[PDB]
Symmetry: C3
Subunit: 321 residues, 3 copies
């Protein structure tokens, strides 16, 4: 009863829990057949993907490139020195050329509005590879990982400790739909987007789930099942970016932070990780799901591509969510 | 009766109309079977292509990369930071290494002479991906597009309005062979190459077609079926490049320009397009074939590869030219 | 009786002659079936390769990329602007992410220690694409070429004339295992690594082969069957790098150098070649195996991948070594 074929994945805001669940289900299916059973499934044979990156990457680049190729399609890697975007060409014109030459586009851009324009003009699916506002494909990998750990998701309390960035916005746009609670801590002045937050409340209300916003790392960690953080220091090289080193004091996740969380707690980090966000004790702790989380970036982006470009239907039995 | 296998495509100058027609025919065939019938044809399975680019690109890069992969071959993208060409290695040595590692090379270079050297030494086909003198693969896409629009080509009058560049040279090297007339306008001092022009006259003479050279945009557009332009402003950043803004006054194609052309006129632009060459009224006009033109860059380069590397013969019935 | 599957290829130091022979044998097999018989062998279908390059390349990039794709796998090209290595990420973390996303990694790094770390942490094969200490895949191509020329290797005397670099170290780590003699000349102060040399002596002793180290180009060439050189001028742009132009006087291989070598002598150069190491008379001489040597870079890296990632066993009859 889920029809995803042909849709864009710009943000989890537009997907119902039933649809996001279909994608994780497909993720499990694909992982089972390929990784466990060892089968070869050329589901994307004859297809191509335009990967436009305005920023560095490895996790997204690698997972998306090997993933698309693993199903028989051809991934096409493009950067700012390749595209004419911004320099020698409009956006409406680029969306049209791409729409006749690729079957889908995955774009990592600075502005979310650019993805909106792109989708408005393109006639092939547009997938958000990360933007200022959201990073939905990261959340898909996170949930599948949590699912693989706890056997279900409903009821879990996610504790966010870090900046009010794209990861949190994507978590806010989806946690409630899985019946999960969200307790988030961000320094004053680094709150998540006001309109995003306003929508997370409504989701929390419609699904009977908790939504706690605080500036206290420990208040957020308190009672949580999953501790989640992410690099908060800006790449903006500057001895004046100390503001973040000064505003984020007490945010480093350590065993102290875990002391106040649920006993069955696990840890998540989208990577790359630095020694500020979390220490090595928690990070390399057997409670850390960082690496299984990274690997799931591959299976989930594969699932996204398959469900937006094919009619393939899952073999595996629907997982317990 | 057409044997193209193993030949280089450095310029349309060396191909007879019968041969260029074979390529467009193959272009139509491939487009029909893949785009319309949805078949998968691994005609280039086991083959690889070396794509050497000394300059940016998107149209050529994308079309060539997705096109080659769509037929089962592996496209290999190389730039100036990859090759050793110019910096740490000769040309005769590079042609030999490439000849043992790829099945063909597509090169976008600054000098046409470099392609000549390359071909002299390489023992695998060399395809011109654009050079100072010509851009034949662009014309293949143009003609197929015109063919798809008018149902035939013979008799059409092409009106060129712009610089005396590679596109025009390629048009000059091929229009007459299809029985098409050419009326071209270029500012004084920006005339097409003298030896190229001298050859276009001879072709015009051998095929009983018209060849008009003028410095008047309107005299060239007058009576034409297809209005064709192209970016004339140089990337050479300089407030002294105004010479082109001053020499090309009156060259912007607008509805005024169309007022004097045949009633069934269409418009072509190889892209990317800027607001100088043409306005939005003509450019996004329903007479503009810009996008179908861009898409055909894919089907035609595919046809080129297949005819130079395989023995594949067209299923589709030979088109009307 | 040779089990290579799953092993790293960091240096020929850890492989027995029987194992290196298996790889050349597989190289011949693959070359025979694909190049001569024209078969298509998707031995690496469903596999991916992470190619991390910290330095330029063409020979390694091209051979490895077309080679991996020719067997049905997907080669993934990464550079310093792609990876986060060094800038935003540790090495232990990168080895783990790669280990879950690719089936093997080929790395061209500056430090050999980095490959050691990488292998320690990664759980997928690591292949040395060239480092400060060694360049084993280059030697595989050399030996196969010599094998194809002389019909056997045992007994040949290899004469090295150049710097005490990675190529020589790799030659030292393997020549004796094939029963070949090594006479090497390097300027004073440019001797090969002391510990590597110490091990080459032991190999020479265990296989009853000769190992001669001298600072005399002619003493090394004297009686040799294969003259081997390599670019000794440093890329370190500096009118003070003249030290190498001054220390390497008399090292240019010319017909004079060949005058004192065995009558059946051949010449090898890993490329790219400059006019300092060798002149055009020797380089383009019919005794030069430079190009067949370059081509064999493809067949040998293919053999490496197949033997480290599959259970494929050679069809061809074991060659005479």
């Amino acid at each position: 009863k889920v029809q995803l074929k042909g849709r864009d994945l710009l943000t989890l805001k537009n997907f119902t829990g039933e649809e996001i669940k279909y994608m994780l289900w497909l993720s499990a299916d694909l992982k089972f057949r390929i990784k466990q059973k060892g089968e070869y499934l050329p589901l994307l044979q004859g297809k191509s993907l335009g990967m436009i990156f305005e920023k560095r990457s490895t996790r997204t680049r690698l997972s998306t490139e090997t993933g698309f190729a693993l199903l028989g399609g051809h991934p096409c890697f493009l950067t700012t020195q390749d595209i004419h975007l911004g320099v020698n060409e409009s956006l409406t014109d680029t969306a049209r050329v791409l729409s006749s030459m690729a079957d889908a586009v995955l774009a990592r851009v600075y502005k979310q509005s650019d993805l909106d324009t792109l989708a408005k003009e393109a006639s092939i699916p547009i997938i958000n590879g990360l933007s200022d506002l959201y990073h939905p494909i990261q959340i898909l990998a996170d949930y599948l990982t949590l699912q693989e750990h706890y056997s279900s998701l409903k009821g879990l309390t996610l504790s966010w400790i870090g900046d009010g960035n794209n990861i949190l916005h994507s978590i806010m746009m989806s946690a409630a739909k899985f019946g999960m609670h969200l307790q988030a801590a961000t320094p004053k002045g680094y709150e998540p987007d006001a309109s995003v937050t306003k929508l997370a409340e409504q989701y929390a209300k419609e699904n009977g789930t908790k939504l706690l916003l605080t500036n206290d790392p420990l208040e957020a960690a308190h009672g949580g099942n999953v501790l989640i953080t992410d690099t908060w220091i800006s790449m903006g090289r500057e001895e004046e970016k100390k503001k973040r080193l000064q505003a984020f004091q007490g945010y480093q996740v350590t065993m102290k932070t875990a002391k106040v969380a649920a006993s069955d707690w696990t840890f998540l980090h989208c990577l790359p990780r630095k020694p500020e966000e979390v220490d090595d004790e928690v990070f390399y702790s057997p409670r850390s799901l960082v690496f299984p989380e990274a690997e799931n970036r591959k299976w989930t982006i594969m699932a996204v591509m398959v469900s937006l470009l094919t009619d393939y239907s899952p073999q595996l039995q629907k997982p317990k969510f």
